[PDB]
């Protein structure tokens, strides 16, 4: 499974796919920590997008995110194969705002 | 099968894959035309590239191109799934220079 550890300001975000990422339905699990302490009850948003490029207009998919057993589960539908940019936006319970970026090849 | 029609000044460039494009060996047929007239004896170059990504170093592949009476066969090996930038460069026998860009999501 696809897995990466991202840095978002002072925050560490581990992201892992449930299975191999493919065109269609996808599930990802996110584990955000701040100085080693897991971020609980946070607002987590995950956006997948392919930027505007020669021959292809920009497209964006917003994941449905839910918190389960201390982890954040992001479900989305990726309508086509190709390279997808991943943007993670987190707002902690205290109001702190963090952002991390990466990309994956489908 | 992948199929696209691009516009380069007065020239139209049709590109079509032989079969469904998949990771590995791929063949494309290019048909450049000027007002319906096939462009024969032209110098045709086709480049496939993936830019630098997290977890992936940049790669560029130049196709091997051959001509058959105005149709140009471009053979290449695309080693990974993901978005490939496609750049077509044509120099006609009469001296015109054209460039068209597109992308292929594998
Ligand atoms: Ag797309
Ligand atoms: Ag694209
Ligand atoms: Ag690549
Ligand atoms: Ag890549």
Q: Which domains does chain A have, with CATH numbers?
A: 3-105 (2.60.40.3340)
DSSP chain A: --EEEEEETTEEEEEEESS---SEEEEEEEEEEETTEE--S-EEEEEEEE--BTTB--EEEEPEEEEETTEEEEEEEE-S-SEEEEEEEEE-TTS-EEEEEEEEE-
From residue A10, give the alpha-carbon distance in Å to each of A34, A92, B15: 7, 12, 47
Q: Which residues partner with B79 through β-bridges?
A: none
CB A18 within 8 A of CB A30: no
The number of beta carbons lying within 10 Å of the beta carbon of residue B91 is 14
The number of beta carbons lying within 10 Å of the beta carbon of residue A34 is 18
* Interface test mutation site (partner B, options A82, A102, A104, max chain B beta carbons within 10 A): A82
- For residue B94, what are the contacts with CB-CB under 8 A and spacing of at least 6? none
From residue A9, give the alpha-carbon distance in Å to each of A5, A70, A74, A104, B59: 13, 21, 21, 21, 30
Candidates B92, B89, B75, B88; CA nearest to B41 is: B92
Rounded-to-integer distance, Cα B72 and Cα B40, Å = 9
SS3 letters across chain B = CCEEEEEECCEEEEEEECCCCCCEEEEEEEEEEECCEECCCCEEEEEEEECCECCECCEEEECEEEEECCEEEEEEEECCCCEEEEEEEEECCCCCEEEEEEEEEC
Taking the centre of ligand 1 as the mean of its atom positions, its distance from the CA of residue B106, in whole angstroms, is 11
Taking the centre of ligand 1 as the mean of its atom positions, its distance from the CA of residue A82, in whole angstroms, is 7
| CA atoms A98, A48, B60, B41: torsion sign | negative
Taking the centre of ligand 3 as the mean of its atom positions, its distance from the CA of residue B58, in whole angstroms, is 7
Whole-number CA gyration radius for chain A: 14
Rounded-to-integer distance, Cα A85 and Cα A80, Å = 13
Rounded-to-integer distance, Cα A3 and Cα A78, Å = 17
For residue A56, give the chain B residue with the closest CA. Answer: B103
- CB–CB contact B101 A56 (8 Å): no
Q: Which residues partner with A99 through β-bridges?
A: A89
- Alpha carbon B58 to chain centroid distance? 19
CB A49 within 8 A of CB A93: no
Q: How many CB pairs under 8 A join A and B?
A: 46
Opening angle at CA B31, ends B26 and B35, nearest 5: 165
Q: Nominal resolution in Å?
A: 2.0
């Amino acid at each position: 499974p696809w897995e990466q550890t991202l840095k978002a300001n002072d925050l560490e975000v581990k992201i892992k796919s449930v299975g191999n990422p493919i065109k269609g339905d996808n599930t990802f699990v996110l584990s955000p920590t701040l100085k080693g302490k897991a971020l609980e009850k946070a607002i987590v948003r995950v956006q997948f997008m392919m930027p505007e490029m020669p021959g292809m207009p920009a497209m964006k998919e917003m994941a449905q995110v839910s918190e389960k057993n201390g982890l954040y589960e992001a479900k989305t539908n990726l309508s086509m194969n190709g390279t997808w940019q991943v943007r993670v936006d987190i707002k902690s319970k205290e109001g702190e705002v963090y952002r991390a970026k990466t990309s994956l090849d489908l």
